[PDB]
Enzyme design. Structure first.
Site, PDB file in Angstrom:
ATOM      1  N   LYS A  19      61.424  19.754  64.762  1.00 51.90           N
ATOM      2  CA  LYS A  19      62.452  20.059  63.457  1.00 51.90           C
ATOM      3  C   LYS A  19      62.007  19.213  62.481  1.00 51.90           C
ATOM      4  O   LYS A  19      61.565  19.421  61.269  1.00 51.90           O
ATOM      5  CB  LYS A  19      63.630  19.827  63.789  1.00 51.90           C
ATOM      6  N   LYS A  38      53.303  10.689  65.900  1.00 51.92           N
ATOM      7  CA  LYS A  38      54.377  11.415  65.667  1.00 51.92           C
ATOM      8  C   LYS A  38      54.633  11.342  64.045  1.00 51.92           C
ATOM      9  O   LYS A  38      55.356  10.259  63.991  1.00 51.92           O
ATOM     10  CB  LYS A  38      55.795  11.347  66.506  1.00 51.92           C
ATOM     11  CG  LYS A  38      56.935  12.128  66.031  1.00 51.92           C
ATOM     12  CD  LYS A  38      57.888  11.908  67.071  1.00 51.92           C
ATOM     13  CE  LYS A  38      59.162  12.805  66.634  1.00 51.92           C
ATOM     14  NZ  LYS A  38      60.250  12.617  67.695  1.00 51.92           N
ATOM     15  N   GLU A  87      52.820   7.136  73.592  1.00 56.09           N
ATOM     16  CA  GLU A  87      51.855   7.664  74.644  1.00 56.09           C
ATOM     17  C   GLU A  87      51.597   8.999  74.603  1.00 56.09           C
ATOM     18  O   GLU A  87      52.191   9.926  74.458  1.00 56.09           O
ATOM     19  CB  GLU A  87      52.521   7.473  75.949  1.00 56.09           C
ATOM     20  CG  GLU A  87      51.753   7.567  77.361  1.00 56.09           C
ATOM     21  CD  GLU A  87      52.868   7.241  78.281  1.00 56.09           C
ATOM     22  OE1 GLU A  87      53.846   6.889  78.390  1.00 56.09           O
ATOM     23  OE2 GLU A  87      52.167   7.811  79.527  1.00 56.09           O
ATOM     24  N   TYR A  88      50.310   9.406  74.756  1.00 54.65           N
ATOM     25  CA  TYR A  88      49.775  10.557  74.722  1.00 54.65           C
ATOM     26  C   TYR A  88      49.972  11.313  76.142  1.00 54.65           C
ATOM     27  O   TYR A  88      49.459  10.702  77.279  1.00 54.65           O
ATOM     28  CB  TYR A  88      48.289  10.583  74.427  1.00 54.65           C
ATOM     29  CG  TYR A  88      47.425  11.913  74.855  1.00 54.65           C
ATOM     30  CD1 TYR A  88      47.961  13.054  74.376  1.00 54.65           C
ATOM     31  CD2 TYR A  88      46.163  11.949  75.542  1.00 54.65           C
ATOM     32  CE1 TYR A  88      47.182  14.285  74.712  1.00 54.65           C
ATOM     33  CE2 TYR A  88      45.584  12.970  75.849  1.00 54.65           C
ATOM     34  CZ  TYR A  88      46.172  14.325  75.403  1.00 54.65           C
ATOM     35  OH  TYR A  88      45.289  15.429  75.806  1.00 54.65           O
ATOM     36  N   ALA A  89      50.448  12.461  76.172  1.00 52.06           N
ATOM     37  CA  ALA A  89      50.769  13.294  77.622  1.00 52.06           C
ATOM     38  C   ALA A  89      49.965  14.430  77.784  1.00 52.06           C
ATOM     39  O   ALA A  89      50.016  15.362  77.010  1.00 52.06           O
ATOM     40  CB  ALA A  89      52.192  13.606  77.674  1.00 52.06           C
ATOM     41  N   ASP A 132      69.697  15.079  74.759  1.00 50.48           N
ATOM     42  CA  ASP A 132      68.923  15.983  74.446  1.00 50.48           C
ATOM     43  C   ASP A 132      67.903  16.618  75.465  1.00 50.48           C
ATOM     44  O   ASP A 132      66.890  16.767  75.024  1.00 50.48           O
ATOM     45  CB  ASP A 132      68.172  15.757  72.964  1.00 50.48           C
ATOM     46  CG  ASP A 132      67.663  16.969  72.200  1.00 50.48           C
ATOM     47  OD1 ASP A 132      68.127  18.132  72.454  1.00 50.48           O
ATOM     48  OD2 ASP A 132      66.896  16.764  71.414  1.00 50.48           O
ATOM     49  N   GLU A 136      61.301  21.477  76.198  1.00 49.45           N
ATOM     50  CA  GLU A 136      60.314  21.121  75.375  1.00 49.45           C
ATOM     51  C   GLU A 136      60.284  19.644  74.932  1.00 49.45           C
ATOM     52  O   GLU A 136      59.481  19.047  74.177  1.00 49.45           O
ATOM     53  CB  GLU A 136      60.584  21.638  73.838  1.00 49.45           C
ATOM     54  CG  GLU A 136      61.949  21.196  73.209  1.00 49.45           C
ATOM     55  CD  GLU A 136      62.437  22.305  72.102  1.00 49.45           C
ATOM     56  OE1 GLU A 136      62.986  21.775  71.072  1.00 49.45           O
ATOM     57  OE2 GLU A 136      62.804  23.125  72.542  1.00 49.45           O
ATOM     58  N   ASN A 137      61.363  18.876  75.651  1.00 50.75           N
ATOM     59  CA  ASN A 137      61.306  17.482  75.399  1.00 50.75           C
ATOM     60  C   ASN A 137      61.090  16.667  76.642  1.00 50.75           C
ATOM     61  O   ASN A 137      60.866  15.533  76.762  1.00 50.75           O
ATOM     62  CB  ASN A 137      62.682  16.729  74.860  1.00 50.75           C
ATOM     63  CG  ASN A 137      62.924  17.028  73.489  1.00 50.75           C
ATOM     64  OD1 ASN A 137      62.134  17.399  72.620  1.00 50.75           O
ATOM     65  ND2 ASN A 137      64.280  17.275  73.147  1.00 50.75           N
TER      66      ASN A 137
HETATM   67  N1  LIG Z   1      53.342  12.156  73.206  1.00 49.01           N
HETATM   68  C1  LIG Z   1      52.865  13.457  73.077  1.00 49.01           C
HETATM   69  N2  LIG Z   1      51.987  14.098  73.985  1.00 49.01           N
HETATM   70  C2  LIG Z   1      51.789  15.315  73.955  1.00 49.01           C
HETATM   71  N3  LIG Z   1      52.295  16.147  72.975  1.00 49.01           N
HETATM   72  C3  LIG Z   1      53.639  15.669  72.531  1.00 49.01           C
HETATM   73  C4  LIG Z   1      53.875  14.277  72.718  1.00 49.01           C
HETATM   74  N4  LIG Z   1      54.880  14.230  71.830  1.00 49.01           N
HETATM   75  C5  LIG Z   1      55.497  15.503  71.089  1.00 49.01           C
HETATM   76  N5  LIG Z   1      54.601  16.302  71.569  1.00 49.01           N
HETATM   77  C6  LIG Z   1      54.619  17.744  71.195  1.00 49.01           C
HETATM   78  O1  LIG Z   1      55.311  17.789  69.967  1.00 49.01           O
HETATM   79  C7  LIG Z   1      56.597  18.459  70.211  1.00 49.01           C
HETATM   80  C8  LIG Z   1      57.623  17.841  69.121  1.00 49.01           C
HETATM   81  O2  LIG Z   1      57.598  16.237  69.621  1.00 49.01           O
HETATM   82  P1  LIG Z   1      59.274  15.825  69.590  1.00 49.01           P
HETATM   83  O3  LIG Z   1      59.026  14.295  69.566  1.00 49.01           O
HETATM   84  O4  LIG Z   1      60.241  16.518  70.465  1.00 49.01           O
HETATM   85  O5  LIG Z   1      59.724  16.109  67.977  1.00 49.01           O
HETATM   86  P2  LIG Z   1      61.393  16.401  67.600  1.00 49.01           P
HETATM   87  O6  LIG Z   1      61.802  14.966  67.611  1.00 49.01           O
HETATM   88  O7  LIG Z   1      61.004  16.830  66.037  1.00 49.01           O
HETATM   89  O8  LIG Z   1      61.679  17.471  68.506  1.00 49.01           O
HETATM   90  C9  LIG Z   1      56.756  18.320  71.488  1.00 49.01           C
HETATM   91  O9  LIG Z   1      57.840  19.707  71.996  1.00 49.01           O
HETATM   92  C10 LIG Z   1      55.642  18.428  72.269  1.00 49.01           C
HETATM   93  O10 LIG Z   1      55.107  19.920  72.289  1.00 49.01           O
HETATM   94 CL   LIG Z   2      71.231  19.061  70.150  1.00 49.10          CL
HETATM   95 MG   LIG Z   3      63.865  14.276  67.421  1.00 50.76          MG
HETATM   96 MG   LIG Z   4      61.936  17.332  70.574  1.00 48.03          MG
END
Ligand SMILES: Nc1ncnc2c1ncn2[C@@H]1O[C@H](COP(=O)(O)OP(=O)(O)O)[C@@H](O)[C@H]1O
Ligand SMILES: [Cl-]
Ligand SMILES: [Mg+2]
Ligand SMILES: [Mg+2]
Ligand SMILES: NNC(=O)c1ccc(-c2ccc(Cl)cc2)o1
Ligand SMILES: [Cl-]
Ligand SMILES: [Cl-]
Length: 267
Positions: A19, A38, A87-89, A132, A136-137
């Site tokens: 978002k 991010k 950290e990179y996943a 949360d 996706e998280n």
């Molecule tokens: N450390 C990471 N490594 C790989 N992909 C990531 C990482 N952090 C976020 N992502 C990708 O980016 C998307 C959004 O990250 P997120 O922190 O959940 O954003 P938001 O807080 O806006 O939801 C995640 O759903 C994932 O697909």
């Molecule tokens: Cl929510």
């Molecule tokens: Mg968020």
């Molecule tokens: Mg998220």
């Protein structure tokens, strides 16, 4: 402690979008360290009035240390953007994996649940609640291990809700959608929702409409497909209780017979 800026990084491919979050692969120039950046726009943050959420995310996530929780190394900002150094996943999201396979087998599901329960047990010992938890998280490390990320909605228990619910209701307990007060037990409701979705391919209260999803959640209306085994049903039914106090402790989840029989990792 160093004070980073955009100049210290070479930016790579987009890893995903949220978002507010726009996440990129990046490499620090001097050390060649690979990480995830991010990016959040200040204008959007101020407009939505979620400065406090971002502060919570930085404060809470940076202090936690656990193998099944994504690290936050630091942050910096400029005239228009805020940058979180993560950290990179490398193996992506559980969400992507579920879309690929449609559903997970019992071994894959139980292992994920164990890793989640381990991470949540660590969080709750500090009275930190995530609030949360959804596919996706949940990110995946180089060995395929699960890692909880996105602590933007996390708080200290007990707590009320002072922010607007933006998107899907699918993973939230009755007490939270009804604007009532909540505690640690909200994460265990979400854990039950996940276990169902892992095995079935879709969350148990899914519907075409916000209003009716709300109805199915507050009334706890869900049914099982025939292929869901008796052990899985027992665990899921215990987690998806309307009364928070009747939901099991995380130790009970970790020591549940179905989990112990199918998980490939321990407590
Ligand atoms: N450390 C990471 N490594 C790989 N992909 C990531 C990482 N952090 C976020 N992502 C990708 O980016 C998307 C959004 O990250 P997120 O922190 O959940 O954003 P938001 O807080 O806006 O939801 C995640 O759903 C994932 O697909
Ligand atoms: Cl929510
Ligand atoms: Mg968020
Ligand atoms: Mg998220
Ligand atoms: N372990 N404790 C830390 O603070 C830590 C470990 C590694 C890093 C780090 C910070 C910034 C960049 Cl750009 C790359 C790596 O920080
Ligand atoms: Cl520096
Ligand atoms: Cl809130």
């Amino acid at each position: 402690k160093r004070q980073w800026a955009l100049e210290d990084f070479e930016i790579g491919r987009p890893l995903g979008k949220g978002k507010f979050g726009n996440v990129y692969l990046a490499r620090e120039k001097q050390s060649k360290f690979i990480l995830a950046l991010k990016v959040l726009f200040k204008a959007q943050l101020e407009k939505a009035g979620v400065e406090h959420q971002l502060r919570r995310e930085v404060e809470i996530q940076s202090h936690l240390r656990h193998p099944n929780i994504l690290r936050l190394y630091g942050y910096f900002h400029d005239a228009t953007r805020v940058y979180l150094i993560l950290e990179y996943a490398p193996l992506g999201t559980v969400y992507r994996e579920l879309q690929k396979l449609s559903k997970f087998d019992e071994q894959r599901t139980a292992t994920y649940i164990t890793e989640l329960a381990n991470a949540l047990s660590y969080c709750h010992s500090k009275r930190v609640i995530h609030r949360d938890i959804k596919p996706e998280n949940l990110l995946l490390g180089s060995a395929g291990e699960l890692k909880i990320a996105d602590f933007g909605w996390s708080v200290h228990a007990p707590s009320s809700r002072r922010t607007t619910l933006a998107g899907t209701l699918d993973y939230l307990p009755p007490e939270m959608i009804e604007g009532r007060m909540h505690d640690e037990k909200v994460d265990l409701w979400s854990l039950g929702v996940l276990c169902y979705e892992f095995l079935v391919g879709k969350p148990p209260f899914e519907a075409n409409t916000y209003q009716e999803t709300y109805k199915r959640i507050s009334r706890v209306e869900f049914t099982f497909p025939d292929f869901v085994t008796e052990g899985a049903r027992d665990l899921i039914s215990r987690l998806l209780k309307h009364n928070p106090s009747q939901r099991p402790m995380l130790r009970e989840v970790l020591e549940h017979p179905w989990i112990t029989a199918n998980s490939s990792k321990p407590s």
